[PDB]
Design an enzyme around this catalytic site. Structure first.
Site, PDB file in Angstrom:
ATOM      1  N   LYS A 148       0.739  -1.351  -0.210  1.00  0.00           N
ATOM      2  CA  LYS A 148       0.174   0.065   0.063  1.00  0.00           C
ATOM      3  C   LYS A 148       1.041   1.150  -0.023  1.00  0.00           C
ATOM      4  O   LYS A 148       1.812   1.229   0.623  1.00  0.00           O
ATOM      5  CB  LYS A 148      -0.866  -0.050   1.497  1.00  0.00           C
ATOM      6  CG  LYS A 148      -1.989   0.998   1.317  1.00  0.00           C
ATOM      7  CD  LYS A 148      -2.711   0.639   2.654  1.00  0.00           C
ATOM      8  CE  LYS A 148      -4.009   1.620   2.676  1.00  0.00           C
ATOM      9  NZ  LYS A 148      -4.764   1.087   3.813  1.00  0.00           N
TER      10      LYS A 148
ATOM     11  N   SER B 135      -9.520   0.588   2.995  1.00  0.00           N
ATOM     12  CA  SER B 135      -8.727   1.373   2.229  1.00  0.00           C
ATOM     13  C   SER B 135      -7.468   0.836   1.521  1.00  0.00           C
ATOM     14  O   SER B 135      -6.916   1.471   0.805  1.00  0.00           O
ATOM     15  CB  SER B 135      -8.228   2.439   3.307  1.00  0.00           C
ATOM     16  OG  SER B 135      -7.444   2.156   4.147  1.00  0.00           O
TER      17      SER B 135
ATOM     18  N   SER C 265      -9.370  -1.876   7.510  1.00  0.00           N
ATOM     19  CA  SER C 265      -9.067  -1.764   6.138  1.00  0.00           C
ATOM     20  C   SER C 265      -8.018  -2.838   5.238  1.00  0.00           C
ATOM     21  O   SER C 265      -7.694  -2.674   4.282  1.00  0.00           O
ATOM     22  CB  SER C 265      -8.139  -0.251   5.953  1.00  0.00           C
ATOM     23  OG  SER C 265      -9.113   1.007   5.627  1.00  0.00           O
TER      24      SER C 265
END
Ligand SMILES: [Mg+2]
Ligand SMILES: [Mg+2]
Ligand SMILES: [Mg+2]
Lengths: 457, 66, 457, 66
Positions: free
Chosen positions: C74, C150, C174
């Site tokens: 990420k 996310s 997330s």
């Protein structure tokens, strides 16, 4: 006579504990109408405690280290069977405490005798102990002047000769300020040293508890008695006892001792500066040292204090605001209204501050500052002047204390008597690194031995 | 924060949190708040980066011994 | 191939690390125009890392446990020489990171090969990875549907077969949400297990980091590689490594396993309930267990998240709110405006909650819940229905995750494939007490062995 | 907190902290804030006593070994 002599008199059989207790009771009866240090007198308990010590002595037992010593506690401490007021009228209707505060239990186990509960600013928010509900506590050296606060009863009871030891609290100055203003000894231990269990809180992130006393030995003996882990207390970090009494007289040879400048000079009046100067000379401190970010340290402490103390009382501010202390209720309300950004920023700053303060103490063993900017002002004072700058009196008393408690460093407040000052005392802070209370106490003992730090009794 | 911005904030915030203030009390609350706003402003001068964390971070349970 | 086959294939010399690297790169080249999981492909670095593994093998060296395994992270993780975006356009002018995130350093030391940075909701505030600046990440099982968030790039890259391992973050769901919606494995370790150093933060009090993977072995191997104290990381409380790989196949005989009800049934749609039912049957769990104060646990997490995340961005919200993500900027602003009393109350409640959750796990080893209320909705969805009740889509995806991360309990998210659900996956949470990641992983392995938890094409 | 009280608060609080809000933005901020206010209200139902402390309390320095 002082703590050590009282204890010796009972141990040696020169006086009974019960006689020592009755003397303190009679002094309270004769002086407290004017001083107004006590809010509750635990007479029956005191007499039974004193009696029990005399029974043990008569059986031939070795007595514990505080055997027969009278003491009293700020009325935010739970006393079994008594409703904990914390200087408020709001708390009057709450059930009586089911148990003593842990620190009271430890003093009791050490043989000390509890005489009762002491006046304070309501909910601990204030530096003058001008309590609207219970009346002001008056300075025993001049009864038209404040005792300081928020532990004003704790300081006044000692300066009036009512008890040799008391307990107070100190979040942003509330042990150190009355010690300064009453001319007695105080110790604010390291944050997380002494258990806060069974006490009424103010600021969870900053409250400290500790003794005030008639001598530096009094501080050390009471501190040693009270030390120890308490797994039921969320704030406690001390995992073992580190006795201070055995090394109290070791002295200060080879220690690095400095005098704080900048903020700590700029916010000190002429008497406060003279007290630091004489303490510095006696301790061999000559270097001026800057404390990191002192004014911002105060600012962050102030922000956290107002929000955490205000929000703690939010339910009562909603339903009974008229029952609070009118001198502080608007400060509590202001605290509740503070943007959450200010709180979070203060908590993030506090990490940086902790790092800078711990780094400062890699180069120094003890640092010296004044405890208060001036000596005790008149009861009812709204504004004070410090080196030409006006301040509201009530917050201003903690200008010099507030940066230091925010880092949680231990401090002995040593009582001194500067010359140009209407015979009123002013205290000096002896500040050490976290966990180094015995350095503060060692430095105090040197001041005491030379006659620089003393009570006037 | 100007005095006018402080007045509006004190009024709206006190209503929102459930502590309605009479005019004299709102003035007293704003007096204290204004002093605190100067302190907060000084805090904003300290440089913090996103990775400058809170002084105390959550611990979900003690780490087990071995 | 899957993780274990890649690692074994490289170790045994049946396939080179460089060939494994080139396959991942070519899959990215062919698929990512549509899936849009990657924001940065570190092609030169990947090839150099893979080449270095092949050199070590050719030298006769013992290869480390992840040797040659491709992964991506990420884009809140610092990658040396690359500007850390954290899903924003605002960060594009910040200097390139001077070092890899600590977790990236640990994966690199274990022999893994970094392929680049992955798309995310801006500043980690969102559960759908519908990023206005970089475009949405699309679900590989149905590209008109969300990947979740996310960490949506982290889930999509694995479900698209681009990489076998990725890193995400999980504050309020997330990692678990994209694992659920993409049909891949996720692990949110215990709060304070894995170092957060060198990552762009969201909520200091709640952020967790962890792997997603193509298999439960992938989770365990990556987790073991990443474990270890980091004295420079303020959030880390893990004092030693507790390997999960050696016990992964120990099974669940004798463990107490329960199924969460109340909140975790009421906020679960028909497919989510069927997935829990089949997982429960396979794991021998029949008893329905109430999680303490789940709805309030969510509330308090929500409050703390919004204030801490919003205040973190205050300087930018002051001058350039129009440059933030339109879908979240007003939520960050709302968070900044929250009364301090809500924050403090939530922090005080969190102590009560921690106590209640730890007490709950004195009776249970593993507790089962669904990961998301429903399977992936269409890109652009504003409102969803769960058992006939409306919720805003974006916050709703975390209804079942948010109470659990607030207590900081470790969770494996196991991918399952319920009937009458358009062939879309949904995850199950296997929740254990703090520090008991290896129980979650053991339970996951039983689900994987029986074929109930698996990936699909 | 009524909707009208929320709107006044959002306006005053945003000005106080320095976040400029146009009218459409203020309405969107109030929409989210209103949902959060219901969450906070639920949190207020939990009985806490004054001695219910914060989940994490300050540690000034590690306690020394011996
Ligand atoms: Mg005004
Ligand atoms: Mg009224
Ligand atoms: Mg070969």
């Amino acid at each position: 006579m002082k703590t050590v002599e009282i204890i010796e008199g009972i141990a040696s059989g020169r006086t009974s504990a019960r006689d020592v207790c009755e003397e303190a009771l009679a002094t309270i009866g004769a002086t407290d109408g004017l001083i107004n240090a006590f809010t509750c007198r635990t007479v029956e308990r005191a007499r039974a405690e004193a009696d029990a010590i005399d029974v043990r002595r008569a059986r031939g037992e070795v007595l514990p280290p505080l055997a027969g010593l009278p003491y009293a506690v700020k009325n935010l401490f739970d006393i079994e069977g008594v409703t904990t007021l914390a200087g408020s009228k709001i708390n009057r209707t709450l059930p009586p405490a089911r148990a003593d505060a842990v620190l009271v239990q430890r003093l009791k186990a050490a043989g000390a005798v509890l005489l009762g509960g002491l006046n304070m600013d309501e909910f601990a928010y204030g530096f003058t102990t001008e309590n609207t509900h219970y009346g002001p506590t008056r300075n025993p050296h001049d009864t038209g002047r404040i005792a300081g606060g928020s532990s004003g009863g704790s300081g006044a009871a000692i300066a009036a000769g009512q008890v040799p030891l008391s307990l107070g609290s100190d979040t942003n100055g509330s042990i150190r300020v009355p010690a300064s203003l009453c001319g007695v000894w105080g110790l604010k231990p390291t944050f997380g040293r002494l258990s806060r269990r069974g006490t009424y809180p103010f600021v969870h992130s900053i409250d400290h508890l500790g003794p005030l006393a008639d001598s530096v030995e009094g501080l050390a003996l009471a501190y040693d008695a009270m030390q120890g882990p308490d797994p039921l207390d969320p704030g406690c970090s001390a995992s073992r006892i580190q006795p201070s009494v055995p090394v109290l007289s070791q002295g200060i040879a080879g220690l690095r001792i400095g005098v704080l400048g900048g903020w700590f000079r700029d916010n000190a009046g002429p008497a406060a500066r003279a007290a630091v100067d004489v303490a510095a000379l006696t301790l061999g401190a000559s270097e001026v040292v800057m404390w990191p970010d002192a004014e911002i340290g105060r600012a962050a402490a102030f922000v956290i204090t107002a929000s955490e103390g205000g929000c703690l009382h939010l339910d009562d501010l909603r339903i009974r605001p008229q029952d609070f202390e009118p001198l502080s209720v608007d400060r509590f309300i202001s605290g509740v209204l503070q943007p959450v950004a200010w709180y979070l920023r203060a908590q993030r700053f506090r990490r940086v501050y902790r790092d800078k303060v711990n780094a400062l103490f890699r180069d120094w063993d003890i640092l010296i500052a004044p405890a208060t900017p001036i000596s005790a002002p008149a009861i009812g004072t709204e504004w004070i002047e410090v080196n030409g700058t006006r301040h509201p009196c009530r917050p201003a008393m903690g200008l010099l204390t507030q940066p230091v408690s925010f880092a949680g460093c231990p401090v002995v407040a040593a009582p001194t008597w500067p010359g140009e000052n209407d015979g009123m005392p002013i205290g000096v802070q002896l500040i050490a690194a976290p966990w180094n209370e015995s350095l503060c106490l060692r430095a105090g003992k040197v001041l005491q031995d030379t006659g620089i730090a003393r009570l006037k009794c | 924060m100007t005095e006018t911005e402080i007045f509006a904030y004190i009024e709206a915030a006190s209503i929102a949190i459930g502590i309605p203030l009479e005019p004299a009390r709102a003035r007293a609350v704003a007096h204290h708040f204004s002093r605190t706003a100067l302190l907060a402003e000084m805090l904003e001068s300290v440089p913090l980066s996103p990775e400058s964390e809170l002084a105390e971070i959550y611990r979900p349970a003690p780490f087990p011994a071995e």
